[PDB]
C-alpha cells in the first residue's frame, strides 16, 4: 500500500475535539500588559471539517483546565499564575449564520 484510504481520511478529519496550540493573548485579551511564557498553551478545541460550505464545526459541551503560566511585567518580577482555559468536549456541524 502507498495511499491513505478514503475511510481513514474521512474518519480522521471529520469535526471533533483535537489538541490545538492557542495563543494566551487570544484567551486573555485584557492582559496585554504581560508577556506570558510559554506564550501559547495546548487545548482540546473543535477542529476538522463538516464537508459542506454551509456548515461549521462548533462546541456543544465545554469545561475548564488550569495551567501554571509565568507572567512577566517589565521591571516588576515575574510570578507564576495559575490561569484557566476553556476546553471543548463535544462538537457538532451546524449551519453557518450571518
Amino acid at each position: 500500500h502507498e495511499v491513505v484510504k478514503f475511510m481513514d481520511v474521512y474518519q480522521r478529519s471529520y469535526c471533533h475535539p483535537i489538541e490545538t496550540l492557542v495563543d494566551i493573548f487570544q484567551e486573555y485579551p485584557d492582559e496585554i500588559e504581560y508577556i506570558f511564557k510559554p506564550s501559547c498553551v495546548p487545548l482540546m478545541r473543535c477542529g476538522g471539517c463538516c464537508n459542506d460550505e454551509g456548515l461549521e464545526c462548533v462546541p456543544t459541551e465545554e469545561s475548564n483546565i488550569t495551567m501554571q503560566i509565568m507572567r512577566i511585567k517589565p521591571h516588576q518580577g515575574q510570578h507564576i499564575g495559575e490561569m484557566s482555559f476553556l476546553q471543548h468536549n463535544k462538537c457538532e456541524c451546524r449551519p453557518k449564520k450571518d
Binding site: K5, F6, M7, Y10, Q11, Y14, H16, C50, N51, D52, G54, L55, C93, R94, P95
Partner: protein
C-alpha cells in the same frame, strides 16, 4: 451470513438528500427478524420510533423531514452468528 441484500463497498455509496424531504438509507436485509442498527459518525445513533424514523426490512431506514443533522457518514450494522457486517453511506445535499 451477510444479512444485507447489497454487498459491502469500501467507498461509501452517495445518497443525495434535500432538507425538508424524506431520506431513505437503503440497507434492506433478507429477514424481518435481523436486528439492524443505524449510526452517524462519530458517535450518534438514530433509533426508529415508527414516526419520524421508521425501519422496514424490505426498504431500510426511512427518515421524514431530513435536516442538516442527517448530513454525513451513516452506517447500518447487523451481527449474524458472532460476525458483524455493515454498509456505509455518505449523504450529500445538492450544492
Amino acid at each position: 451470513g451477510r444479512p444485507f441484500v447489497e454487498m459491502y463497498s469500501e467507498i461509501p455509496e452517495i445518497i443525495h438528500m434535500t432538507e425538508g424531504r424524506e431520506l431513505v438509507i437503503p440497507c434492506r436485509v433478507t429477514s424481518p427478524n435481523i436486528t439492524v442498527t443505524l449510526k452517524k459518525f462519530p458517535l450518534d445513533t438514530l433509533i426508529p420510533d415508527g414516526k419520524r424514523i421508521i425501519w422496514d426490512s424490505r426498504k431500510g431506514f426511512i427518515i421524514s423531514n431530513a435536516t442538516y443533522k442527517e448530513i454525513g457518514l451513516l452506517t447500518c450494522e447487523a451481527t449474524v452468528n458472532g460476525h458483524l457486517y455493515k454498509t456505509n453511506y455518505l449523504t450529500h445535499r445538492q450544492t
